[PDB]
Design a protein around this ligand. Structure first.
Ligand SMILES: C[C@@H]1CCC(=O)N1Nc1ncnc2[nH]c3cc(F)ccc3c12
Ligand SMILES: [Cl-]
Length: 167
């Protein structure tokens, strides 16, 4: 048993809710919140901008030190950093950005990072400003992640479409 509340169960291990991931993170304080990161960990907008804003820019400060030491992530890759006031840890995961021409096939690799964590609160990777079809992202999530994932979908119309179209 865990403290996630109000989720619809899609599969044995995937759950979904219409929620703002920032407010969900602040309420639950999960062990792991997933950020929709880019390779430079520049948290300017979308989920990343919102998570970073909620940390009063501490996520960005930590991220800039990470990049200065390690260089950029790979598309499809991840790193574990602090969750600040939102979670114990933040798993920064880079899904492909279709608006940059990045290979949508890398979305499966991106979701494989979730399997290193028993339970996660997460957005749909490559959705929103990353330009992929969220219905496809949900399908890849369900077919790739084997650990317990609680998906937060900000947009109510999209949430309803994801549920109603789920196979
Ligand atoms: C990209 C995915 C696909 C469907 C969807 O809604 N996405 N985004 C979110 N998902 C969950 N919480 C969020 N909080 C946010 C706060 C923001 F400023 C901006 C975006 C989000 C957001
Ligand atoms: Cl977005």
């Amino acid at each position: 048993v865990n403290s996630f509340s109000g989720y619809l169960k899609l599969t044995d291990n995937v759950y979904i809710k219409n929620a703002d991931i920032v407010e969900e993170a602040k309420k639950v304080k999960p062990t792991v919140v997933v950020n929709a990161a880019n390779v430079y960990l520049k948290h300017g907008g979308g989920v990343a901008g919102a998570l970073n804003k909620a940390t009063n820019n501490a996520m960005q400060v930590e991220s800039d030190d990470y990049i200065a030491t390690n260089g950029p992530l790979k598309v499809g890759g991840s790193c574990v950093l602090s969750g600040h006031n939102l979670a114990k840890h933040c798993l920064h995961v880079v899904g492909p950005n279709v608006n940059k021409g990045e290979d949508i096939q890398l979305l499966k690799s991106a979701y494989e990072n979730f399997n290193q964590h028993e339970v996660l609160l997460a957005p749909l990777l490559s959705a929103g400003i990353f330009g992929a079809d969220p219905i496809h992202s949900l399908r890849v999530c369900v077919d790739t992640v084997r650990t317990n994932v609680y998906l937060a979908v900000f947009d109510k119309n999209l949430y309803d479409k994801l549920v109603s179209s789920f196979l």
